[PDB]
Design an enzyme around this catalytic site. Structure first.
Site, short mmCIF file in Angstrom:
data_model
loop_
_atom_site.label_atom_id
_atom_site.label_comp_id
_atom_site.label_asym_id
_atom_site.label_seq_id
_atom_site.Cartn_x
_atom_site.Cartn_y
_atom_site.Cartn_z
N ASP B 335 0.87 -1.19 0.00
CA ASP B 335 0.00 0.00 0.00
C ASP B 335 0.90 1.23 0.00
O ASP B 335 1.81 1.32 -0.84
CB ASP B 335 -0.96 -0.11 1.18
CG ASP B 335 -2.05 0.95 1.15
OD1 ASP B 335 -2.88 0.96 0.22
OD2 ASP B 335 -2.05 1.79 2.07
N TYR B 466 -1.41 11.31 2.69
CA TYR B 466 -2.21 11.64 1.52
C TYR B 466 -2.19 13.11 1.15
O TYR B 466 -2.80 13.49 0.15
CB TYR B 466 -3.68 11.28 1.73
CG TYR B 466 -3.99 9.82 1.86
CD1 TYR B 466 -4.32 9.06 0.74
CD2 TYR B 466 -4.00 9.21 3.10
CE1 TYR B 466 -4.64 7.72 0.86
CE2 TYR B 466 -4.31 7.88 3.23
CZ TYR B 466 -4.63 7.14 2.10
OH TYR B 466 -4.93 5.82 2.24
N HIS B 524 -7.49 -6.31 -0.60
CA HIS B 524 -6.47 -5.29 -0.36
C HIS B 524 -5.50 -5.67 0.76
O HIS B 524 -4.32 -5.31 0.70
CB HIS B 524 -7.13 -3.96 -0.02
CG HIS B 524 -6.15 -2.90 0.32
ND1 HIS B 524 -5.39 -2.26 -0.64
CD2 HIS B 524 -5.76 -2.39 1.51
CE1 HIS B 524 -4.59 -1.39 -0.04
NE2 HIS B 524 -4.80 -1.45 1.26
C1 LIG Z 1 -1.70 8.78 -4.36
O1 LIG Z 1 -2.18 8.96 -5.70
C2 LIG Z 1 -2.17 7.87 -6.53
C3 LIG Z 1 -1.96 6.57 -6.11
C4 LIG Z 1 -1.83 5.55 -7.03
C5 LIG Z 1 -1.60 4.13 -6.58
C6 LIG Z 1 -0.90 4.04 -5.23
O2 LIG Z 1 0.30 4.21 -5.16
N1 LIG Z 1 -1.66 3.83 -4.13
C7 LIG Z 1 -1.06 3.48 -2.84
C8 LIG Z 1 -1.39 4.51 -1.78
C9 LIG Z 1 -2.89 4.71 -1.67
N2 LIG Z 1 -3.53 3.56 -1.03
C10 LIG Z 1 -4.55 3.69 -0.16
O3 LIG Z 1 -5.19 4.72 -0.05
N3 LIG Z 1 -4.88 2.57 0.51
C11 LIG Z 1 -5.79 2.54 1.64
C12 LIG Z 1 -7.03 1.70 1.43
C13 LIG Z 1 -7.14 0.82 0.36
C14 LIG Z 1 -8.28 0.06 0.17
C15 LIG Z 1 -9.33 0.18 1.07
O4 LIG Z 1 -10.52 -0.54 0.86
C16 LIG Z 1 -10.68 -1.68 1.50
F1 LIG Z 1 -10.74 -1.53 2.81
F2 LIG Z 1 -9.72 -2.54 1.26
F3 LIG Z 1 -11.81 -2.25 1.14
C17 LIG Z 1 -9.23 1.04 2.14
C18 LIG Z 1 -8.09 1.79 2.31
C19 LIG Z 1 -3.50 5.02 -3.02
C20 LIG Z 1 -3.12 3.95 -4.03
C21 LIG Z 1 -1.91 5.84 -8.39
C22 LIG Z 1 -2.13 7.15 -8.80
O5 LIG Z 1 -2.29 7.56 -10.10
C23 LIG Z 1 -2.38 6.57 -11.12
C24 LIG Z 1 -2.26 8.17 -7.88
#
Ligand SMILES: COc1cc(CC(=O)N2CCC(NC(=O)NCc3ccc(OC(F)(F)F)cc3)CC2)cc(OC)c1
Ligand SMILES: COc1cc(CC(=O)N2CCC(NC(=O)NCc3ccc(OC(F)(F)F)cc3)CC2)cc(OC)c1
Ligand SMILES: [Mg+2]
Ligand SMILES: [Mg+2]
Lengths: 548, 548
Positions: B335, B466, B524
């Site tokens: 992540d 973020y 995830h």
């Molecule tokens: C930052 O901007 C971006 C990021 C990317 C890709 C990237 O590196 N990421 C990693 C860091 C972030 N991860 C995240 O928030 N995870 C938390 C989370 C995930 C699932 C959840 O849902 C559930 F709970 F699992 F159901 C609940 C919480 C964004 C993704 C690509 C891009 O452009 C193409 C721009």
């Protein structure tokens, strides 16, 4: 006006031989036109491949093909043919690998920082993604740690000799040009610094440059006495905590990678007592675990005496390894720690890669004599009887912590203590000064570190190590049929008047393959008395007996 | 009456093949009389060499010569000649080295302890001071950790089948004979236990013995579903603290020896999220450093947003290595941690032995598009805009910590969250239950660990990851000319509906030698969803790309 900062180039100054010097030889060795390699290296100038590499735009691996094409292009204009064996990758691998720290230069930088200078490394360098990149990384870490700032062209996107990087340097140093001396082996790199008004030294040979730097700084950097080994700043260490059972957690400091080397201090000391060994041992390729022994420092200090018998102490060290996931460690002890490591080797040889003791010999229990009888049959051990009564010695040692450690931590020609009259006199400090002078071995700051440590729990725990004579004896007797047959080192210190070298004379009867070291003009506090000699003995022994 | 404790012999039960079985073959292989080796091994009975060895009176190395003399004595009475090649040392080295854990047996012991049994290993064993002793030590650590007690004849001075050792066992177990089942492969060892009234199982073949143990315990131990990998008990871990700058210290957990593997969790997680990987990776020969990332757990959580841009996070990881004395580490992220490890590889390749990311692809910055535009051009990333405003998401996530993590930590077929409607709905949990059910992936206890962790600092720090979109973009653009050419692994998870596998499809353009892994039916939360598969992919990749 008075210099207050010192800036060191890396290649050709802090690290020798310079890459250009090796490439120069490579040109000859391979019968290439003089300077062809340097031409290829520099082709394009500010817009060429090497400037992109030095600014971090590309990695070293991306840069090799471009260097290769520059070499072809250069040989073509020169109407020569590159050898069939020609490999830029191999040429630079060699050059990079041949580079060692220029120790006289590093030690002058260290002396300058000791006297209050802000020191920095300013280097044109690359992002190294070669398979062999670990070598260079190790070199930078070993240098990095001795300087206030490391400025790398490829991390800041600027290269010497662009004036922007010297303005960045000056702002990083929080100093004005005339307050800074800058040392480089390339005059082109000095011109912009000189423009700003900073002192520059063109480093051709190290000693000439060091004489120039002595003159401008007013500090003697050449022909200085031998410096002590690198010490430890407590707040810069990684601190580890392991709960070995309810209510008992062990604290330790960790530095380095490689085989685990656990350091076990004596009474009344601390992991800090190894401060001169930790960086050296880490540098030599070991993962050092300097421990606050049970009762000490940030380690738990339960009040009950039997928590400090050797059997419980050894089981806890074993639990310590289990919880860290180490099947083995080398155990290096001093004083009470040395006694503990011997018993680690006697009772848990499978967990002990190798054992070394400083000062403390292995003395097999005498089954026909109570340990009390034997203690009474040696005047030098008289102080131990004084330690028996709970609370008595605690009260004298805890009364004035500064005085305690200033009185204890002394070189052989500075002692203020007579370990043989302690009971009669009714105390350890009875005939000792209230404000002792600071020994040459320690600074007031180092003394204050120990003072702060023993404010946590006092001396009950540490004194309890002396209060299990019978328990330890009964347990030690269980091993009288054993020998220690793992790699083992006994280090004696000539002027330890309590733990005398002669005490170890019979050790080979129980440790047939025992290795020995001897340190002359060394008192009881061996690690801080003769740190450089300790590190040599220990490191040599490790490489020959604990490493594979 | 109902069993409450289970005692396992080691040799022939938890560890196969038994030493006697190998020696038996050695007898044949070398054309010796049947049983001669076993005769020599047992000569003297209670008063012979082997009983002294098993009681700790002597070490294994001391015992070999005695064994040798027993073998000569035995061959002489048998009117046979021992081969010229005869070496007891070599014979036992082989036998000891061939011994592997009996996995079906260990997993039954584990199942029994899971259901409330006190488990113990009772073994006749020796103090091993052979040069090769590390092998056996590793075996005991790996078994040791799964049991309440390890009782070794040589540490307690008693041997099976002496009745005293079973009374010692019973007192150690705090149980009465009829409450204990004891499993051994030697009937002589069962007789005294049977005398006391404990259930005994003679272990000839593992599955028959496991059927007998299923019957007496009432627990299914054979044909059980596959167990999860070993997890971590937080209070049993070594905890490390490194100050990387004033006010900022990193916490991490450490287990194992070997090349350093640093694990970097995502949002909103913890070192504990790697709890299924840490023991496996340590067991596979790595030194694992599971970190509480900046903002999390016992790591510092400064309030300012720019403390969490990627550039500052990466420099701090580098400082972390410096202060621990590691020139390199393997970086394995998930992540947000996976994004950080990619940038570690892009900006500090010399400090990165190898990089692996779970779920998070490497997406090169688009220099012609603000990161905000790109986030807005993907409905699934809509929740990130909700995270932008300081305090808003903190208030919803900190309101009910139990509900937060019960709502988040769910398998793909259990989700209660719609990441694409977050802003519109005004919240992450707007249409989610107040008391969600406990997902199959987590226990209430594991949930409560995360609850306790995030009570320390809340979500400000973690949400600040973020809030540096523009900063990270500007820094990432500086690397657009680079490639990642160090060993690299991308692991995709089929049912991660935010970080979808397709997102990684172009990665080879920037990571030409990228290796890949794929996990099906995995959401995830990859490490706790498919821990066994993660550990296989990671460990295989490590051994082929990070080890030498
Ligand atoms: C930052 O901007 C971006 C990021 C990317 C890709 C990237 O590196 N990421 C990693 C860091 C972030 N991860 C995240 O928030 N995870 C938390 C989370 C995930 C699932 C959840 O849902 C559930 F709970 F699992 F159901 C609940 C919480 C964004 C993704 C690509 C891009 O452009 C193409 C721009
Ligand atoms: C336990 O009984 C014994 C111990 C031994 C030998 C042995 O293992 N020791 C190690 C543990 C103890 N060390 C100790 O107290 N050091 C503290 C200290 C030393 C010098 C100091 O003086 C000055 F400050 F340096 F000036 C001030 C403080 C006793 C010695 C042999 C034996 O019988 C043959 C019986
Ligand atoms: Mg230079
Ligand atoms: Mg057996």
């Amino acid at each position: 006006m008075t210099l207050r900062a010192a800036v060191f180039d890396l290649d050709g100054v802090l690290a020798l031989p310079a890459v250009f010097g090796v490439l120069g030889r490579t040109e000859e060795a391979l019968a290439l036109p003089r300077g062809l390699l340097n031409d290829a290296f520099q082709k394009g100038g500010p817009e060429g491949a090497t400037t992109r590499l030095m600014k971090g735009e590309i990695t070293l691996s991306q840069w090799i093909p471009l260097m290769e094409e520059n070499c072809r292009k250069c040989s073509e204009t020169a109407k020569v043919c590159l050898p069939k064996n020609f490999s830029i990758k191999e040429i630079f691998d060699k050059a990079i690998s041949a580079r060692k720290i220029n120790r006289p230069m590093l030690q002058a930088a260290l002396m300058l920082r000791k006297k209050g200078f802000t020191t920095a490394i300013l280097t044109n360098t690359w992002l190294d993604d070669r398979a062999e990149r670990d070598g260079l990384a190790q070199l930078m870490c070993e240098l990095k740690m001795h300087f206030d700032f490391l400025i790398e062209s490829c991390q800041v996107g600027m290269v010497k000799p662009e004036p922007q990087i010297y303005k960045f340097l000056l702002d990083t140093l929080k100093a004005s040009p005339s307050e800074v001396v800058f040392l480089d082996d390339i005059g082109a790199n000095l011109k912009p610094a000189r423009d700003l008004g900073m002192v520059t030294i063109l480093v051709q040979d190290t000693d000439t440059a060091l004489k120039e730097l002595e003159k401008v700084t007013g500090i003697q950097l050449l022909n200085t006495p031998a410096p002590l080994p690198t010490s430890c700043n407590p707040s810069d260490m990684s601190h580890g905590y392991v709960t070995v059972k309810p209510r008992v957690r062990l604290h330790f400091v960790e530095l380095g990678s490689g085989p685990a080397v656990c350091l076990c201090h004596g009474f009344p000391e601390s992991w800090y007592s190894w401060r001169y060994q930790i960086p050296a041992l880490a540098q030599a390729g070991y993962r050092v675990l300097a421990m606050d022994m049970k009762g000490y420092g940030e380690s738990s200090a339960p009040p009950e005496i039997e928590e400090y018998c050797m059997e419980v102490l050894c089981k806890e060290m074993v639990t310590f390894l289990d919880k860290l996931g180490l099947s083995q460690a080398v155990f290096i002890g001093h004083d009470w720690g040395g006694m503990l490591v011997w018993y680690m080797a006697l009772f848990y040889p499978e967990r002990v890669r190798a054992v070394a003791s400083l000062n403390t010999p292995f003395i097999p229990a005498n089954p026909n004599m109570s340990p009390l009888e034997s203690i009474k049959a040696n005047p030098v051990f008289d102080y131990q009887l004084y330690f028996q009564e709970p609370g008595v010695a605690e009260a004298e040692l805890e009364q004035n912590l500064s005085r305690t450690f200033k009185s204890l931590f002394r070189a052989s020609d500075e002692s203020v203590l007579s370990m043989h009259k302690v009971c009669e006199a009714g105390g350890l400090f009875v005939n000792s000064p209230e404000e002792p002078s600071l020994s040459r071995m320690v600074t007031e700051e180092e003394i204050q570190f120990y003072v702060q440590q023993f404010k946590k729990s006092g001396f009950r725990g540490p004194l309890n190590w002396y209060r299990n004579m019978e328990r330890n004896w009964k347990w030690a007797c269980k091993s009288l049929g054993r020998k220690i047959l793992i790699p083992a080192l006994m280090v004696t210190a000539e002027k330890d008047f309590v733990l005398v070298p002669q005490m170890s004379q019979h050790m080979e009867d129980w440790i047939p393959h025992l290795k020995r070291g001897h340190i002359e003009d060394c008192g009881h506090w061996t690690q801080m008395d003769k740190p450089t000699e300790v590190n040599q003995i220990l490191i040599k022994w490790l490489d020959s007996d604990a490493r594979n």
